[PDB]
RNA sequence: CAAGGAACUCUGCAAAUUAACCCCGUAAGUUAGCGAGAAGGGGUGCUUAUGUAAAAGUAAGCCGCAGUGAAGAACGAGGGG
RNA sequence: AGCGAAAUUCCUAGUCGGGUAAAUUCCGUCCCGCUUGAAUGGUGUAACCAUCUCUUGACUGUCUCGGCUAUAGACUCGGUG
RNA sequence: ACCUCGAUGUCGACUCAUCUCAUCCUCGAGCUGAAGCAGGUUCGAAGGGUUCGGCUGUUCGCCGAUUAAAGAGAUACGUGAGUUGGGUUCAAACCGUCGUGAGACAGGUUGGUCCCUAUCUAUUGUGCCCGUAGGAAGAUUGAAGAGUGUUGCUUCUAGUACGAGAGGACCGAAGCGAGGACACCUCUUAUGCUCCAGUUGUAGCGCCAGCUGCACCGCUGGGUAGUAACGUGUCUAUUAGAUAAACGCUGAAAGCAUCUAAGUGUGAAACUAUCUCAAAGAUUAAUCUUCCCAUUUCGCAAGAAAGUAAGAGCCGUCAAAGACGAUGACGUUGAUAGGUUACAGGUGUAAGCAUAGUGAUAUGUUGAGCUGAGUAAUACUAAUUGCUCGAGGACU
């Protein structure tokens, strides 16, 4: 469960190595953000040579999560690191490639462009 | 309404994989047929309801009063006996089962006492928020929380009735609804229900029609494991 | 008129129950097929790894396979006697525990479990 | 905090109403007659049938 | 409140079984409180049940918990429960000590109590 | 104490990280004395053999999730009054 | 002369730049400095400080958010009081 | 300047909130310079909700990102016998300014002791006594009450209604959530001080091996039962009645008109119920069922001496319970607790022996050994052969 103000990596090709969350997007006091949530984050740790600069707010999408998530069937998925895949308003993702592994719930909520050019679904 | 009810006493919880690729927290109850001690009319008593006997249990273990009437009505020695309202339609002295009471995945509501836990605080009690830990701090950490309504002539200058502090939790009826029953074992006398069920293992538990959804039901059917031996 | 809960409780996790349920130990590598459902027809997807842990008695048989994908590990946990999904065992390693948890603080050249076991 | 109104000789009373003693459970032992409380051994050491310790 | 006593820890616990189990075993009556004598219980029978065959493993485990005593040290206690004590309870299904409630101390009011091996 | 890691608060208060020995490496500034244990890293267990007065060390092998396996050992960088 | 929104600036949360998603605090600079200023010394300054102030890495129950365990109390019994 | 100077602790923050409506959101309606969408204003409505941060001691305030919304106030500008002391306002020190000076400044800055074991009442829980007019054991009705009531997004309806176009519905249906609440431990985690294993130092068991004491439970990796959420189940619906604003139909006073005067309707998260909990000390003390009392004499009758039962209590073993009471199970005609047996779960192949190696160590016996609480049988041990209380219901 990531949370107001946390450090994670991003998993896609945009120039940004470290983003910081801002608000957990979606309702009043939203306390954490699962498999699939999206949220409003800053990028702190950029490139030279990237699309994002630092400073700027943005809009992301996570996909990975350490604490991991459990799924109706019983299954608990569960990751090494919080990842998130910097999307625009259409939902598409900002880059041109996707770094590792993503998860199905993006599937429930629409995000078809990010699987589709992802490298294996989990 | 036409209210249906039956007693049993929770043995555990368990799951089961159903089709639709769901797996459902389960609660397993044990039933014991139960026996309709009494009907109360509307027209002869003011109110309709039916009071049955349930957990028998050998006649030297019961007391002499209970003993008589139950010799009286002609029923077999229980020692518990409850009623549910508007609960009519069953003929007195007749073995009931939830087979004949509910359907395989309908809806139903369980009231049960729960766990006991004694005296608790106020934040374990009311959901209260714990004080600060550190950056300086006082004797009550733990602290309920002010109960100042107002100081001064003009003012209550009292505690409200009903305030909320410690005290006693647990040990009290409780019910929860919309819990649909699972499945059927007739010769274990053995009810599954989904869900969790309040109360210790082998309470007493009463399993009602839900007064949100009475005829609602919703289908559910379990999954055949086509796992072949190597 | 003496209840035994865990006979009862024993019986409705056999309905359910699976026939061969293939063994296998603490740190031992296997192979888990999906049967994904899609809207239609199923994809068989595979899940290859390594167990770390075998918890539970019966309908709630447990057990964590870890894989690694372009060098992320992912750990996932599985439960035994669930339909859809097969298990089929394919090496089996020598471990000195049950929980191998420094598996998840291990990893490349040190992360490989030598094979035998009894 | 001290209370600003002194307790009469009344309302102490009214308080000590619970602290009425009660009278321990006393039965007979069965081989010298003396009076021992219920369900322990007498002076003899001996309960029921069996000698548990020496005599006094 | 601080410099409180260590208090009835634990390892105290365990020493305080470990102590009565030894004298009960070399005398055969031991005086305590009921509340104690409740707790050594356990530990006496199940000794004496793992000491019914005699083997150097079960030698192993008894002494993990017999302490010197004044009739007798630690080895002639192994001795004398392995050849005198345990032998007698060779087909009793248990029980093989009783405790029984004696009065209130004089100056404690606490419920004494006589832990006894049971012929 | 899972996930997050100062979001708490007047303030990282308090708590937490580092900690012994040995081997590498160590900047700006300066009154040329310092800065400096700067920063940043690595090794430590047991056995055999070689080494010595004793070592330290060196080579091979073995075990454990972890080897000053427990106790006692410095958190750091930058700017300003 | 030097320094200057200062332990000094009332107006004032002064203008601008930097640090932050966002900065009455901080750093640099600007100067109508109401009322700075040269042995009640002025301006700089390496090292040092259980000094003050600000940013930051690791770190953690400070916090989101509370939960569990063990003692000594509290609570029950006997004695003093 | 009326109370208080033989003492009413004063800002802000934290915890807990309660109340009012002059309503921020949700709900209903009239008008619109209301095409649709989105608005503006007024009326009705207080059931619920009404975010997190940067700077400042701050209230306030500006800014950032969300939300359906980030409402206005009162309660000693609520709340220090609840917490903090950052600010103000003690003694210390310095700057600017005033004073010849000691000193001063709603000018600035650094530092700087926040006590009390609750008697009454109020409140949250839990008991004893007595009453309920014979006693006791059960099952009820429900007078008076308490608790919850928030809402968003997507799809369909439908690119339909409207609109040159752009854009884009009311009504209704389905799915998925956030917050809050109740319960539970199958799953995921946290804890799990008489559990398992690995392991260091030292002192002991005369030595090796193997154990014990101590070193935060010595440390480390797991972990039974139990306790919990970060976990998963459920709720946060619906309906009926009487209505507020508003709209009416039929209708006159006032031949027209007119919602009203008679009569008859529609109408909101507000009200009364439906939902959950508790409830006959409700002294206005209720109802039903079952069981036990129904002696001999003397005289005096809700009189005596003895004499008659259901049941309850004392005591013991306990835990579905629990501060202590109480609640619940059992007390030999018994499975209440311990022990034994078997098993589950947990830990991870025990000690010893044999082989191999020069040795540390590996391999086989061996999924072995061990195990606090867990499951079920088994009277082996402890619940003794005991004591006390307890009934004839006045009359109308
Ligand atoms: O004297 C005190 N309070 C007095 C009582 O007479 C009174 O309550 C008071 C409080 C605040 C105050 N003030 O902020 O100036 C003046 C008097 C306390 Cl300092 Cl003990
Ligand atoms: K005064
Ligand atoms: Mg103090
Ligand atoms: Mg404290
Ligand atoms: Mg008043
Ligand atoms: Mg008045
Ligand atoms: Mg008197
Ligand atoms: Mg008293
Ligand atoms: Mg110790
Ligand atoms: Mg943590
Ligand atoms: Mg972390
Ligand atoms: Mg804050
Ligand atoms: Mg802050
Ligand atoms: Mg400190
Ligand atoms: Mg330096
Ligand atoms: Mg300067
Ligand atoms: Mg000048
Ligand atoms: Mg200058
Ligand atoms: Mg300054
Ligand atoms: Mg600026
Ligand atoms: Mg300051
Ligand atoms: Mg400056
Ligand atoms: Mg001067
Ligand atoms: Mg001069
Ligand atoms: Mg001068
Ligand atoms: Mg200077
Ligand atoms: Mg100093
Ligand atoms: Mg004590
Ligand atoms: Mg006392
Ligand atoms: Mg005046
Ligand atoms: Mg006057
Ligand atoms: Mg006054
Ligand atoms: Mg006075
Ligand atoms: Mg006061
Ligand atoms: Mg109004
Ligand atoms: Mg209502
Ligand atoms: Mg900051
Ligand atoms: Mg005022
Ligand atoms: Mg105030
Ligand atoms: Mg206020
Ligand atoms: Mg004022
Ligand atoms: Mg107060
Ligand atoms: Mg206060
Ligand atoms: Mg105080
Ligand atoms: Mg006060
Ligand atoms: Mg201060
Ligand atoms: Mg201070
Ligand atoms: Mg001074
Ligand atoms: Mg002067
Ligand atoms: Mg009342
Ligand atoms: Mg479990
Ligand atoms: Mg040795
Ligand atoms: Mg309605
Ligand atoms: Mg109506
Ligand atoms: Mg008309
Ligand atoms: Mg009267
Ligand atoms: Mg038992
Ligand atoms: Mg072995
Ligand atoms: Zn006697």
């Given at each position: 469960?990531?949370?107001?103000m ?24 939203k ?6 949530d ?6 702190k ?12 707010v943005?809009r992301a ?25 910097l999307?625009k ?34 | ?10 043995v ?8 639709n ?32 006997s ?30 549910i ?24 509501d ?7 836990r ?28 002010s ?8 003012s ?20 929860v ?5 699972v ?20 309470g007493?538990?009463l ?24 | 008129?003496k209840?035994?809960?865990?006979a ?11 026939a ?16 994904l ?5 199923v994809?068989?997807?595979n ?24 060098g ?6 599985f ?5 859809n999904?097969?298990?089929e ?15 998840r603080?291990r990893?490349?050249?040190?992360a490989?479990?030598?094979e035998?076991?009894? | 905090?001290?209370?600003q ?25 069965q ?8 369900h ?17 | ?25 070399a ?10 004598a ?7 029978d ?5 000491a ?13 918990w ?28 248990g029980?093989?000590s ?22």
């Open positions: 469960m990531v949370s107001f946390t450090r994670l990596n991003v998993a896609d090709n945009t120039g940004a190595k470290q983003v910081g969350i801002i608000k957990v997007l979606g309702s009043t006091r306390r954490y953000a699962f498999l699939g999206v949220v409003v984050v800053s990028v740790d950029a490139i030279p040579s990237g699309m994002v600069k630092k400073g700027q943005l999408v996570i996909v990975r999560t350490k604490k991991g998530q459990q799924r109706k069937d019983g299954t608990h998925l569960k990751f090494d690191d919080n990842a998130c895949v999307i308003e259409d939902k598409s993702p900002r880059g041109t490639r996707i770094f590792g592994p993503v998860a199905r719930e993006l599937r429930e909520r629409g995000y078809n462009k990010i699987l589709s050019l992802a490298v294996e679904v989990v | 309404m036409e209210i249906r009810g039956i007693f049993g006493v929770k555990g919880m368990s799951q089961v994989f159903t089709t690729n769901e797996r459902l927290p389960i609660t397993v109850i044990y039933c014991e047929p139960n026996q309709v001690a009494g009907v109360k009319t509307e027209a002869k008593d003011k109110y309709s309801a039916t009071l049955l349930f957990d028998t249990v050998e006649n030297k273990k019961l007391n002499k009063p209970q003993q008589g009437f139950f010799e009286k009505n002609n029923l077999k020695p229980t020692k518990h006996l409850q009623e309202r508007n609960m009519t339609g069953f003929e007195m002295g007749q073995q009931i089962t939830p087979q004949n009471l509910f359907q395989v995945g309908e809806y139903v369980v009231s049960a006492i729960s766990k006991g004694g005296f608790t605080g106020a934040i374990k009690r009311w959901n209260f928020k714990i004080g600060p830990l550190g950056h300086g701090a006082g004797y009550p950490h733990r602290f309920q929380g109960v100042q309504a107002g100081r001064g002539g003009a209550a200058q009292r505690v409200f009735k009903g305030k909320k502090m410690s005290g006693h939790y647990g040990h009290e009826k409780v019910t609804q919309n819990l649909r029953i499945g059927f074992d007739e010769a274990n006398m053995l009810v599954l229900v989904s869900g969790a069920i309040a109360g210790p293992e082998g007493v538990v399993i009602r029609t839900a007064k949100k959804k009475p005829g609602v039901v919703k289908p559910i059917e379990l999954a055949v494991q086509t796992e072949k031996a190597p | 008129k209840i035994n809960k865990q009862l409780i024993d019986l409705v996790e056999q309905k359910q129950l699976k061969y349920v293939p063994e296998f130990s603490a740190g031992d590598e296997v192979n888990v097929a999906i049967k459902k899609e809207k239609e027809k994809r068989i997807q899940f290859t790894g390594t167990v770390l842990r075998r918890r539970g008695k019966g309908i709630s048989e447990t057990f964590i396979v870890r894989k690694t994908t372009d992320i590990p992912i750990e996932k946990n439960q035994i006697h669930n339909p999904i097969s298990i065992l394919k090496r089996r390693g020598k471990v000195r525990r049950a929980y191998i948890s420094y598996m603080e990893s490349g050249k040190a490989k479990i030598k035998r076991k009894q | 905090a001290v209370q109104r002194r307790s009469s000789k009344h309302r102490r009373d009214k308080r000590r109403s619970h602290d009425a003693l009660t009278a321990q459970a006393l039965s007979v032992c081989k010298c007659g003396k009076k021992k409380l219920f322990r051994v007498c002076s003899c050491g001996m309960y029921g049938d069996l000698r548990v310790k020496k005599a006094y | 409140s601080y410099i409180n006593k260590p208090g009835k820890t634990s390892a105290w616990r365990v020493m305080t079984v470990r102590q009565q189990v030894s004298a009960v075993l005398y055969g009556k031991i005086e305590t409180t009921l509340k104690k409740k707790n050594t219980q356990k530990r006496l199940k000794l004496i049940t793992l019914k065959v005699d083997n150097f493993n079960n030698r192993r485990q008894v002494k993990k017999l302490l010197n005593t004044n009739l007798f040290d630690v080895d002639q206690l192994m001795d004398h429960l392995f050849s005198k004590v345990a032998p007698k309870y060779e087909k009793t299904p029980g093989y009783r405790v029984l409630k004696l009065g209130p101390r004089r100056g404690d009011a606490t419920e004494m109590a006589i832990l006894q091996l049971t012929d």
